Amino acid sequence: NIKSAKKRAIQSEKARKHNASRRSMMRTFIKKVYAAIEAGDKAAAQKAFNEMQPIVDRQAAKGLIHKNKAARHKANLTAQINKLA
Template sequence: MANTPSAKKAARKIARRTVVNGARRSRMRTYLRKVEEALASGSQDDARAALKAAEPEIMRAAQKGVLHKNTASRKVSRLAARVKALSA
């Protein structure tokens, strides 16, 4: 348990940040799930629209520190490749 006032304050800050990051992560995963569902349905138009909505969310998560920048870029790249492959 935190003993010093600064450690107690740090613990409060971490708790608040954890809640915020959890919400951001959940929101991002929701958008990812929508892209996955669109890919599974086989509709390229739906998949393209879902990806267009998901990409800013993924990059926002990276910007806010929920994901690493390279991880976010990799996710977007792989999703885009899968959406592109639907037409082939």
């Protein structure tokens, strides 16, 4: 409130609206692979796996994911489809 860098509190929700959009942009493509897990095609998920596969790694690169949740989520999902075969 009182300090001369109160513009940081203006810049926070200026930033947060962008990053939570990239959060929202990230999660729906992590969600999108979980659309086709329950269907039963090993490549329907794998084709959409390559839709988040840059996007979770663009956003690990842009500065939101700490490089290790991406290593988590590209590992379980790759073994998700291979659990059935």
